[PDB]
Short mmCIF file of C-alpha atoms in Angstrom, two decimals:
data_model
loop_
_atom_site.label_atom_id
_atom_site.label_comp_id
_atom_site.label_asym_id
_atom_site.label_seq_id
_atom_site.Cartn_x
_atom_site.Cartn_y
_atom_site.Cartn_z
CA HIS A 1 115.47 127.01 88.45
CA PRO A 2 116.48 127.76 84.80
CA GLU A 3 117.73 124.17 84.31
CA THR A 4 114.47 122.61 85.46
CA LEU A 5 112.75 124.87 82.91
CA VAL A 6 115.14 123.58 80.24
CA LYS A 7 114.16 119.99 81.11
CA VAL A 8 110.48 120.90 80.96
CA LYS A 9 110.95 122.28 77.44
CA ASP A 10 112.82 119.08 76.52
CA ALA A 11 109.86 117.08 77.82
CA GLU A 12 107.64 118.80 75.28
CA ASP A 13 109.98 117.81 72.48
CA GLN A 14 110.13 114.18 73.60
CA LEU A 15 106.36 113.81 73.94
CA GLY A 16 105.31 116.11 71.10
CA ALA A 17 102.82 117.71 73.47
CA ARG A 18 102.22 120.77 75.62
CA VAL A 19 103.53 120.67 79.19
CA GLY A 20 102.25 122.84 82.04
CA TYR A 21 104.49 123.48 85.04
CA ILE A 22 104.44 125.64 88.12
CA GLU A 23 106.55 125.74 91.27
CA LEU A 24 105.28 127.52 94.39
CA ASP A 25 106.81 128.51 97.69
CA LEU A 26 104.56 126.81 100.19
CA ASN A 27 104.84 129.68 102.64
CA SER A 28 104.91 132.92 100.66
CA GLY A 29 103.08 131.32 97.75
CA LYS A 30 105.45 133.17 95.44
CA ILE A 31 106.03 131.62 92.01
CA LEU A 32 109.56 130.20 91.70
CA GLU A 33 109.28 128.71 88.21
CA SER A 34 106.62 128.38 85.53
CA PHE A 35 105.85 127.25 81.99
CA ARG A 36 102.38 127.62 80.45
CA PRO A 37 101.13 128.53 83.94
CA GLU A 38 97.82 129.73 82.52
CA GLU A 39 96.90 127.23 79.80
CA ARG A 40 94.25 124.60 80.42
CA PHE A 41 94.86 120.90 80.86
CA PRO A 42 92.65 117.95 81.88
CA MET A 43 92.83 117.49 85.67
CA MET A 44 92.29 113.75 85.55
CA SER A 45 92.34 111.90 88.91
CA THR A 46 94.10 114.99 90.20
CA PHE A 47 90.69 116.42 91.15
CA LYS A 48 90.20 113.75 93.81
CA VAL A 49 92.33 115.83 96.17
CA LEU A 50 90.13 118.87 95.57
CA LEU A 51 87.10 116.59 96.14
CA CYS A 52 88.21 115.31 99.53
CA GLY A 53 88.98 118.91 100.36
CA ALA A 54 85.33 119.75 99.80
CA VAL A 55 84.27 116.74 101.88
CA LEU A 56 86.54 117.87 104.76
CA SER A 57 85.20 121.40 104.53
CA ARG A 58 81.78 119.95 105.28
CA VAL A 59 83.00 117.77 108.13
CA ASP A 60 84.34 121.02 109.64
CA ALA A 61 80.89 122.59 109.16
CA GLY A 62 78.90 119.79 110.82
CA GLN A 63 77.48 118.66 107.48
CA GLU A 64 79.37 115.41 107.19
CA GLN A 65 81.13 112.81 109.31
CA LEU A 66 84.29 110.90 108.42
CA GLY A 67 82.86 107.90 110.29
CA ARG A 68 79.59 107.78 108.32
CA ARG A 69 79.26 104.47 106.50
CA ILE A 70 78.01 104.20 102.93
CA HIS A 71 76.54 101.16 101.14
CA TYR A 72 76.46 100.71 97.38
CA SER A 73 75.62 98.31 94.60
CA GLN A 74 77.39 96.28 91.93
CA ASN A 75 75.65 98.66 89.53
CA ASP A 76 77.60 101.58 91.04
CA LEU A 77 81.06 100.19 90.24
CA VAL A 78 82.90 101.75 87.31
CA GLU A 79 86.19 101.02 85.57
CA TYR A 80 89.17 100.75 87.98
CA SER A 81 87.77 100.33 91.49
CA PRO A 82 90.58 98.44 93.26
CA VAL A 83 89.27 98.94 96.81
CA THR A 84 85.53 99.61 96.33
CA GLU A 85 85.09 96.29 94.46
CA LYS A 86 85.94 94.60 97.73
CA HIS A 87 83.27 96.13 99.94
CA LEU A 88 79.92 95.44 98.30
CA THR A 89 78.47 93.64 101.31
CA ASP A 90 79.86 95.82 104.12
CA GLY A 91 80.22 99.25 102.47
CA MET A 92 82.83 101.90 103.35
CA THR A 93 83.20 104.97 105.56
CA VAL A 94 83.63 108.46 104.15
CA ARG A 95 87.14 108.24 105.65
CA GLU A 96 87.91 104.97 103.83
CA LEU A 97 86.48 106.37 100.59
CA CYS A 98 88.64 109.47 100.66
CA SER A 99 91.65 107.32 101.44
CA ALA A 100 90.79 105.06 98.50
CA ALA A 101 90.18 107.98 96.13
CA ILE A 102 93.43 109.82 96.86
CA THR A 103 95.64 106.87 97.81
CA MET A 104 94.59 104.34 95.15
CA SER A 105 92.88 106.72 92.73
CA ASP A 106 89.78 104.49 93.10
CA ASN A 107 87.07 105.65 90.67
CA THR A 108 83.89 104.39 92.27
CA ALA A 109 85.13 105.91 95.53
CA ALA A 110 85.35 109.34 93.90
CA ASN A 111 81.88 109.02 92.37
CA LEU A 112 80.35 108.00 95.71
CA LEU A 113 81.95 111.10 97.23
CA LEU A 114 80.66 113.36 94.47
CA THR A 115 77.14 112.09 95.24
CA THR A 116 77.89 113.04 98.87
CA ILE A 117 78.14 116.74 97.93
CA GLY A 118 75.72 116.96 95.00
CA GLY A 119 77.97 116.08 92.05
CA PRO A 120 80.55 117.87 89.82
CA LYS A 121 78.57 121.14 89.82
CA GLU A 122 78.98 121.40 93.60
CA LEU A 123 82.72 120.72 93.58
CA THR A 124 83.01 123.52 91.01
CA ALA A 125 80.90 125.76 93.27
CA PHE A 126 83.10 125.01 96.28
CA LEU A 127 86.25 125.94 94.28
CA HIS A 128 84.67 129.16 93.16
CA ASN A 129 83.76 130.25 96.70
CA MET A 130 87.42 130.05 97.68
CA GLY A 131 88.55 132.21 94.79
CA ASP A 132 89.39 129.68 92.10
CA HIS A 133 87.30 130.76 89.11
CA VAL A 134 89.21 128.56 86.68
CA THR A 135 89.17 124.96 87.88
CA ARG A 136 85.99 123.12 86.96
CA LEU A 137 84.68 119.58 87.17
CA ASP A 138 81.85 118.69 84.78
CA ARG A 139 81.59 114.93 84.47
CA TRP A 140 82.01 111.83 86.62
CA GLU A 141 84.45 108.91 86.41
CA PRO A 142 85.52 107.58 83.92
CA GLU A 143 84.36 110.14 81.36
CA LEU A 144 86.10 113.17 82.91
CA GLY A 145 89.39 112.01 81.38
CA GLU A 146 88.47 112.22 77.71
CA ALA A 147 90.56 115.29 77.05
CA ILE A 148 89.02 116.26 73.74
CA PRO A 149 91.29 118.97 72.31
CA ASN A 150 90.01 122.48 73.08
CA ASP A 151 87.33 121.01 75.36
CA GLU A 152 87.40 123.07 78.58
CA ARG A 153 85.39 120.52 80.59
CA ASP A 154 87.24 118.95 83.52
CA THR A 155 90.24 121.28 83.25
CA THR A 156 92.40 123.50 85.42
CA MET A 157 95.48 125.68 84.87
CA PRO A 158 98.81 124.87 86.56
CA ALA A 159 98.73 128.25 88.32
CA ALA A 160 95.17 127.75 89.65
CA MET A 161 95.53 124.16 90.84
CA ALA A 162 98.68 125.10 92.70
CA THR A 163 97.31 128.25 94.30
CA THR A 164 94.31 126.16 95.25
CA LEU A 165 96.20 123.16 96.66
CA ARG A 166 98.16 125.66 98.75
CA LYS A 167 95.03 127.29 100.23
CA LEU A 168 93.75 123.81 101.12
CA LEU A 169 97.01 122.59 102.71
CA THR A 170 98.12 125.81 104.32
CA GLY A 171 95.32 128.34 104.54
CA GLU A 172 92.54 128.97 107.03
CA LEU A 173 90.07 127.23 104.69
CA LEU A 174 90.21 123.91 106.55
CA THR A 175 90.76 123.37 110.28
CA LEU A 176 94.26 122.15 111.09
CA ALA A 177 93.01 118.65 111.88
CA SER A 178 91.57 118.68 108.35
CA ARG A 179 94.64 120.22 106.66
CA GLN A 180 96.64 117.48 108.35
CA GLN A 181 94.25 114.74 107.22
CA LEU A 182 94.36 115.92 103.60
CA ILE A 183 98.12 115.97 103.41
CA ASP A 184 98.39 112.70 105.36
CA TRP A 185 96.27 111.05 102.64
CA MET A 186 98.42 112.44 99.84
CA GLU A 187 101.60 111.36 101.60
CA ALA A 188 100.16 107.82 101.70
CA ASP A 189 99.78 107.77 97.91
CA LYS A 190 100.27 104.12 96.83
CA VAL A 191 100.37 104.82 93.11
CA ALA A 192 102.45 107.60 91.54
CA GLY A 193 105.55 105.44 92.17
CA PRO A 194 106.99 105.87 88.64
CA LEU A 195 106.53 109.66 88.83
CA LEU A 196 108.11 112.33 91.02
CA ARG A 197 108.60 109.75 93.81
CA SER A 198 111.18 107.80 91.79
CA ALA A 199 113.48 110.85 91.76
CA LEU A 200 113.09 111.55 95.46
CA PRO A 201 115.91 110.73 97.86
CA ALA A 202 115.28 109.29 101.32
CA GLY A 203 114.67 112.03 103.89
CA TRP A 204 112.59 114.16 101.58
CA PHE A 205 108.90 114.69 102.29
CA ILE A 206 106.33 114.17 99.55
CA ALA A 207 102.54 114.33 99.49
CA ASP A 208 101.04 113.89 96.04
CA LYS A 209 98.29 112.80 93.64
CA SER A 210 98.82 111.67 90.06
CA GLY A 211 96.45 111.67 87.12
CA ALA A 212 96.18 109.80 83.84
CA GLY A 213 93.81 110.33 80.92
CA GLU A 214 92.96 109.75 77.27
CA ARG A 215 95.11 111.21 74.48
CA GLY A 216 98.39 110.95 76.37
CA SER A 217 97.12 112.97 79.32
CA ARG A 218 99.24 112.73 82.48
CA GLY A 219 99.92 114.90 85.50
CA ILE A 220 100.72 115.25 89.17
CA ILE A 221 100.36 117.67 92.04
CA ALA A 222 102.57 117.56 95.11
CA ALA A 223 103.89 119.21 98.19
CA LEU A 224 107.51 118.13 98.73
CA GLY A 225 110.67 119.20 100.56
CA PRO A 226 114.03 118.23 102.07
CA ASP A 227 114.56 117.24 105.71
CA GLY A 228 111.19 115.49 106.09
CA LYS A 229 109.14 118.67 105.68
CA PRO A 230 107.39 120.09 102.57
CA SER A 231 108.33 123.59 101.40
CA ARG A 232 107.23 123.77 97.76
CA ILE A 233 104.23 122.92 95.64
CA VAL A 234 104.82 121.47 92.19
CA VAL A 235 102.13 120.99 89.55
CA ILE A 236 102.77 119.20 86.26
CA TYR A 237 100.41 118.44 83.35
CA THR A 238 100.65 117.19 79.81
CA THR A 239 98.03 116.30 77.19
CA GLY A 240 98.27 115.39 73.51
CA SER A 241 101.16 112.95 73.39
CA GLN A 242 101.05 109.60 71.63
CA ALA A 243 103.80 108.26 73.91
CA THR A 244 103.69 105.13 76.11
CA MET A 245 102.58 105.39 79.71
CA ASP A 246 106.17 104.44 80.58
CA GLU A 247 107.47 107.25 78.34
CA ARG A 248 105.22 109.89 79.85
CA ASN A 249 106.25 108.65 83.28
CA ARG A 250 109.95 108.96 82.45
CA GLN A 251 109.58 112.60 81.35
CA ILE A 252 107.81 113.36 84.60
CA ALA A 253 110.42 111.68 86.78
CA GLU A 254 113.20 113.51 84.94
CA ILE A 255 111.56 116.88 85.56
CA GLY A 256 111.55 115.96 89.23
CA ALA A 257 115.17 114.91 89.10
CA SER A 258 116.00 118.45 87.84
CA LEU A 259 113.80 120.14 90.41
CA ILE A 260 115.62 118.25 93.14
CA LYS A 261 119.14 118.49 91.72
CA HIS A 262 118.67 122.26 91.48
CA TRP A 263 116.75 122.83 94.70
#
């Protein structure tokens, strides 16, 4: 909607930074709204959904098991590991790790899962085989969120990420038990409160994953809809701002408020 686009543009002014935005019809996949659909932004923790998508693809192929339990060391822990910190003695299942990565944005959890599939290069390979020749993961946590200007490492485009999230949630790429599990994990997102969720009325469905990074980087991907069912995909990214976390949050929430008001 034209007015959501207006608010997007206003968000650039307020942050002094680029903003990427796309809006997809979940069914047809048709583009309903866009701004800088094809510029590159840092993915940030937003990749963790793509990651668990790769993990599920393997479960479907007999090359992994959600129940498999993984043990790790104090030396494996990186910055921000809210749930992995608490399981040094007993370890965690692939299931629990994917939940922790998507749901709590747990960093060690994501790393552990990257090891599972052969690292960043293999995630990028997986993406490529499904027709996304743009999205690319290059480093591990926490260094993938450095967002050096012009650096194309660890980036996607709003249009790609969205087309890709749709294929994962909706397409024949995963089995339906797996499509369901992916979206169930996003729906259970325990962070992202200050974002799109704060503009969502009761009764609306939302499954999402947020991302934060260096140099004012912030973003979110989501499937959302009225009447307890999702019907659109929204992808939002910004990088470059010098604004507070709170301030970058606010601009996000307000974009959502427009999206919803003008549904």
